Design a protein around this motif. Sequence first.
Motif, mmCIF file in Angstrom:
data_model
loop_
_atom_site.group_PDB
_atom_site.id
_atom_site.type_symbol
_atom_site.label_atom_id
_atom_site.label_comp_id
_atom_site.label_asym_id
_atom_site.label_seq_id
_atom_site.Cartn_x
_atom_site.Cartn_y
_atom_site.Cartn_z
ATOM 1 N N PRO A 87 -49.019 -69.543 85.869
ATOM 2 C CA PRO A 87 -49.116 -71.002 85.793
ATOM 3 C C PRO A 87 -47.755 -71.667 85.905
ATOM 4 C CG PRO A 87 -49.231 -70.084 83.608
ATOM 5 C CD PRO A 87 -49.205 -68.910 84.553
ATOM 6 N N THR A 88 -47.783 -72.961 86.237
ATOM 7 C CA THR A 88 -46.546 -73.723 86.373
ATOM 8 C C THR A 88 -45.834 -73.920 85.041
ATOM 9 O OG1 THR A 88 -45.604 -75.825 87.116
ATOM 10 C CG2 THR A 88 -47.817 -75.877 86.166
ATOM 11 N N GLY A 89 -46.522 -73.712 83.924
ATOM 12 C CA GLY A 89 -45.910 -73.872 82.619
ATOM 13 C C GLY A 89 -46.774 -73.251 81.546
ATOM 14 N N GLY A 90 -46.182 -73.088 80.367
ATOM 15 C CA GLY A 90 -46.890 -72.500 79.252
ATOM 16 C C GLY A 90 -46.864 -70.987 79.298
ATOM 17 N N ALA A 91 -47.401 -70.387 78.241
ATOM 18 C CA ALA A 91 -47.390 -68.937 78.130
ATOM 19 C C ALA A 91 -48.427 -68.309 79.048
ATOM 20 C CB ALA A 91 -47.647 -68.509 76.690
ATOM 21 N N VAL A 92 -48.123 -67.105 79.525
ATOM 22 C CA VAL A 92 -49.039 -66.310 80.332
ATOM 23 C C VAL A 92 -49.160 -64.938 79.683
ATOM 24 C CG1 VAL A 92 -47.239 -65.477 81.895
ATOM 25 C CG2 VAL A 92 -49.627 -65.476 82.624
ATOM 26 N N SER A 93 -50.384 -64.430 79.588
ATOM 27 C CA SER A 93 -50.601 -63.134 78.963
ATOM 28 C C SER A 93 -50.278 -62.007 79.934
ATOM 29 C CB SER A 93 -52.044 -63.015 78.481
ATOM 30 O OG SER A 93 -52.419 -61.656 78.344
#
Lengths: 44, 44, 196, 44
Positions: free
Chosen positions: C188-194
């Motif tokens: 994603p363009t922002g935020g956490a990724v699992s």
Amino acid sequence: VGIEAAIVLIAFVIVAAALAFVALNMGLFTTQKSKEVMQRGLEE
Amino acid sequence: VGIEAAIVLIAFVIVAAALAFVALNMGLFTTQKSKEVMQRGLEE
Amino acid sequence: VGIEAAIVLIAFVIVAAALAFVALNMGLFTTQKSKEVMQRGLEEATSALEVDGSVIANVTSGSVDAIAIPIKVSPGREGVDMSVDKTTVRVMLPSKFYENAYCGVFDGSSLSDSKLSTITSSIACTTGWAYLVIFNGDGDNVLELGEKGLLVLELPTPLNSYEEFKVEVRPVQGAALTVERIVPASLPTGGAVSLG
Amino acid sequence: VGIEAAIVLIAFVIVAAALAFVALNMGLFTTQKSKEVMQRGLEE
């Protein structure tokens, strides 16, 4: 008589500690890799 | 009477030290090789 | 005739007494040291440390910036010391290799909240990036049972898509922890990724 | 001649007793801790 027995005991305990260290390290790594591979299989 | 007992004690301690050296050396080597072989098995 | 025999007897008894004194002293010392070394071996047997959960990464501008690795202590209690001078963290990157990126352990006072951005931003290290954050702890620099630890990496412009990384922790006592993950295709363009 | 031999014998027996005391104490402790750790593993 006791002293050499103590030395042998120390050596054998130290060997066991190294074996335990190796066993836990590799077991944790292989469990993590199994988790990853089954996750990838579910993805596939 | 004491002196020969001390000499025998020194000899027996020295023998134990050599046994300990051999035991630790070979134990570390065999643990490393076990790590390598199980890693290769996981690779296979 | 008797007197010289008595003198020799006295000398030989005195020699034996000195031998006995030395023997008991050194035997007691070596027994104590054997006790200590086998106790230390039993200590080294436990205190494994292991990964508890999923590794979570921070992505900004389409590339992975920070990595959070959740860890806990193995069954057997006997906590692991997480002091700066006793623990080393190894990071193996596709184009970089770092031998020691550990900067220390800062208590997880929950900050303003438990945001990944808040944790990565409020905490800063003078040298190095990787630090560990303890949760539900008693304020010590030792990770014990009942305490949850989250180890965070601050990586300046590594980690695009699809390349692997390797993270290793080297405690003074106990087994080294090995972590290897691969960045997924979808970021994603922002935020956490699992990372799974 | 006999007296110094007896003294050395007394010393060596006393050393062995201390070694035995240490060995039993630590063996009992390590057996108890092994029991506890395997119980905790079964719990986990």
